[PDB]
Design an enzyme around this catalytic site. Structure first.
Site, PDB file in Angstrom:
ATOM      1  N   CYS A 122       0.760  -1.242   0.000  1.00 45.99           N
ATOM      2  CA  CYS A 122       0.000   0.000   0.000  1.00 45.99           C
ATOM      3  C   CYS A 122       0.800   1.307   0.000  1.00 45.99           C
ATOM      4  CB  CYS A 122      -1.001  -0.020   1.165  1.00 45.99           C
ATOM      5  SG  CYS A 122      -2.299  -1.292   1.000  1.00 45.99           S
ATOM      6  N   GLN A 149      -6.439   7.299  -0.888  1.00 48.69           N
ATOM      7  CA  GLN A 149      -6.407   5.877  -1.184  1.00 48.69           C
ATOM      8  C   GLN A 149      -7.581   5.283  -1.952  1.00 48.69           C
ATOM      9  OE1 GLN A 149      -4.623   3.521   2.188  1.00 48.69           O
ATOM     10  NE2 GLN A 149      -4.150   5.541   3.061  1.00 48.69           N
ATOM     11  N   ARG A 256      -9.763   7.680   2.352  1.00 46.42           N
ATOM     12  CA  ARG A 256     -10.268   6.863   1.269  1.00 46.42           C
ATOM     13  C   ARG A 256     -11.060   7.745   0.306  1.00 46.42           C
ATOM     14  NH1 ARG A 256      -9.805   1.283   2.453  1.00 46.42           N
ATOM     15  NH2 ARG A 256      -8.148   1.688   0.916  1.00 46.42           N
ATOM     16  N   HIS A 263      -3.299   4.709  -5.301  1.00 51.25           N
ATOM     17  CA  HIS A 263      -3.222   5.479  -4.073  1.00 51.25           C
ATOM     18  C   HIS A 263      -2.399   6.697  -4.438  1.00 51.25           C
ATOM     19  CE1 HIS A 263      -4.988   2.394  -1.809  1.00 51.25           C
ATOM     20  NE2 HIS A 263      -3.921   1.803  -1.302  1.00 51.25           N
TER      21      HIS A 263
END
Length: 357
Positions: A122, A149, A256, A263
């Site tokens: 991530c 993200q 988010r 991302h």
């Protein structure tokens, strides 16, 4: 050739791994043995079968790893365990891989006897792929982060929910959008009414994502007020770099947004020295072949520094580079990276390549 077992290869992350391995013809350099959890190939739970392999690559998940890993190790099995799951990330027994950034820690762990490798993932790996040059030159004092993200980090059904939400918002004003003279305020009221309706699909996120955002990713970390997602920045970054004993501060808020696979992150980097922006750009660009410094120009930024451009590619553009009003040691930077590749499957594919070479 090494005998390699694959678990969870039909999941989203596992599927990206299969596709990438095929694209690079990685299967011609190893003997693949596929497993399954289905009772409808060998069973992912048959320990004796797993013990016959030299390496096990799993994208099945944390529950799976916490269940079989211990049982497999108990049989005396001395092979390698490559995990895409985060379960073993902080085990002193394992190394977090992201070879373009920490090949040195990987090579050493191998000489020392480490047999477990968990993929860099991530926002942390995407960050390191973008500004690893600054860390390598030991120029980072600390880093304040703000993330944007994608849904893929949460899962396949989350990506699907996002897409359904966007369709519903437009469909709520489909006719109004058709006539060029309709009231924008009437349109907005309807769209807003729709995202607030009880029948608006928000089960996977627990809130609307589509035309909104959620400033909270994982669960609360009581001792600091951080969420697990935010906690990873400090913990995982330093573990990857092998600076766990003398860690570099990395903190911020993880948010988010309505993106599918990429991302993005906004950085405020406090450097230890005052270097010309040109040199900083050179240091950043020189770290690896995937990072791509984008000129602080409008048209080039719009075409290159976006999820729309980056999705599905291994490129890690970094731009909007300039000194901040706080001082010559404060650097601004913005980066975009695909979550399923450098954020998940690619680091795993790469360590596997090394283990079977």
């Amino acid at each position: 050739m090494k005998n390699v077992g694959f678990i969870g290869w039909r999941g989203m992350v596992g599927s990206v791994l299969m596709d990438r391995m095929s694209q690079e013809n990685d299967f011609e350099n190893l003997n693949p043995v596929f497993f399954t959890t289905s009772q409808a190939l060998k069973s992912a739970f048959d320990i004796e079968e797993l013990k016959k392999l030299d390496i096990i690559v799993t994208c099945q998940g944390g529950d799976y790893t916490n269940e079989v890993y211990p049982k497999l190790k108990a049989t005396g099995w001395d092979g390698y365990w490559v995990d895409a799951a985060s379960a073993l990330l902080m085990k002193d027994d394992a190394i977090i891989v992201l070879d373009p950034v920490n090949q040195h820690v990987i090579s050493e762990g191998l000489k020392k006897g480490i047999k477990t490798f968990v993929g860099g993932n991530c926002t942390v790996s995407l960050m390191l792929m973008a500004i690893g040059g600054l860390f390598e030159k030991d120029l980072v004092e600390w880093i304040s982060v703000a993330t944007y993200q994608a849904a893929s980090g949460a899962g396949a059904k989350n990506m699907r929910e996002l897409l359904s939400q966007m369709g519903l918002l437009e469909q709520a004003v489909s006719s109004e959008l058709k006539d060029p003279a309709s009231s924008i305020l009437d349109i907005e009221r309807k769209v807003t009414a729709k995202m607030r309706a009880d029948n608006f699909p928000t089960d996977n996120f627990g809130a609307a994502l589509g035309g909104s955002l959620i400033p909270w990713i994982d669960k609360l970390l009581p001792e600091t007020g951080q969420t697990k997602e935010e906690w990873k920045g400090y913990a995982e970054t330093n573990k990857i770099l092998g600076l766990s004993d003398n860690p570099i501060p990395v903190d911020g808020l993880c948010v988010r947004i309505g993106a599918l696979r990429c991302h993005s992150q906004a950085f405020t980097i406090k450097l230890k020295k005052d270097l010309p922006l040109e040199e900083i750009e050179q240091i950043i660009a020189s770290h690896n072949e995937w990072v791509k410094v984008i000129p602080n120009d409008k048209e080039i930024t719009l075409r290159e520094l976006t999820p729309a451009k980056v999705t599905g590619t291994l490129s890690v553009p970094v731009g909007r580079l300039r000194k901040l009003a706080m001082g010559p040691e404060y650097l601004a930077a913005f980066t975009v990276g695909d979550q399923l590749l450098w954020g998940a499957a690619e680091p795993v594919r790469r360590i596997l390549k090394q283990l079977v070479a």
